[PDB]
Amino acid sequence: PSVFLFPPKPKDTLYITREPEVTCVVVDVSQEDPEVQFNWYVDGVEVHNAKTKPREEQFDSTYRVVSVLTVLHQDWLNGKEYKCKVSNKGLPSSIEKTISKAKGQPREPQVYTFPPEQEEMTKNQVSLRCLVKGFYPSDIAVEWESNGQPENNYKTTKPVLDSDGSFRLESRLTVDKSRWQEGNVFSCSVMHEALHNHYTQKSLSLS
């Protein structure tokens, strides 16, 4: 009977028109609905604006209950503590979790792009690489774009810790070789709190 607490999507905290939320999940292998209750707290003060969904059966036959707490962009970025406490109805025993933005001087990402490797120029689909390093905290969003429109066909690694305490990750965008050959510009878009206006972009095209 275990509880998970997830931070907001990094993009949501960095763009004020987005709706960042923290997410509390209860996973339970037992059919018996124990009628879980959530208490939420921001820096130890209970709040009441969480939206909790009904118990649902998962594909693996376990049961999960999801509770979402809307958060203020600055509240997350200023290191406020989000506490999820879970109770079965009228039974005082409880499990809690706490998360918060990691502490430490924010550091700006450095962004590198790489064209496809030439022994890949024999394939129908080629890869573009965006390497991002030197950043703190780990909270970051990496996306791609071309001709002012999003590219969805990318995979991004989990953040890895370098030995100076800053993080790094790599994204790879897979596109049809014809698109790369026709001279289209592909932008790696990087969103991090330590970047000016939380955004920078590096661009890649054939010459």
Residue numbers in the entry: 238 to 444
Reproduce, without paraphrasing, sentences from the article in which this PDB structure was first reported.
Here we report a structure-guided approach to engineer monomeric Fc molecules to adapt multiple versions of half-life extension modifications. The pH-dependent Fc–FcRn interaction is a key contributor to the prolonged serum half-life of antibodies and their derivatives. Past efforts to engineer a monomeric Fc, defined as one set of CH2 and CH3 domains, have proved challenging due to the extensive interactions to be disrupted in the CH3–CH3 dimer interface. Monomeric Fc molecules would provide a quick and robust method for achieving structural insight at the Fc–FcRn interface.
Based on SEC-MALS and DSF results, the S354E mutation was selected to be explored for the general applicability of the MFc platform. First, to confirm its compatibility with our original monomeric Fc construct, we generated MFc3, the S354E point mutant of MFc1, along with its aglycosylated variant (N297D), for crystal structural confirmation. Crystals of the aglycosylated MFc3 protein grew readily and diffracted to 2.4 Å. The solved structure demonstrated that the MFc3 molecule maintained the monomeric state at high protein concentration. MFc3 in the aglycosylated form (N297D) was crystallized in the C2221 space group with cell parameters a = 102.97 Å, b = 110.93 Å, c = 87.18 Å, Matthews parameter VM = 2.49 Å3/Da with two polypeptides in the asymmetric part of the unit cell, and solvent content of 50.62%. The diffraction limit of the crystal was 2.3 Å. Superposition of MFc3 (orange) with a previously resolved structure of MFc2 (or C4n) (light purple) shows that both maintained a similar monomeric Fc structure, and the S354E mutation did not cause any notable change in the Fc domain structures. Aside from a minor change of the R405 side chain position, all the other original sets of dimer-disruptive mutations in MFc1 aligned nearly perfectly with each other. Importantly, this crystal structure demonstrated that, as designed, the glutamic acid side chain substitution at position 354 indeed protruded out and disrupted the kind of interaction we observed in T1. Using solution analytical methods and crystallography, we demonstrated that S354E was able to sustain a monomeric Fc structure, and the glutamic acid side chain protruded out as designed.
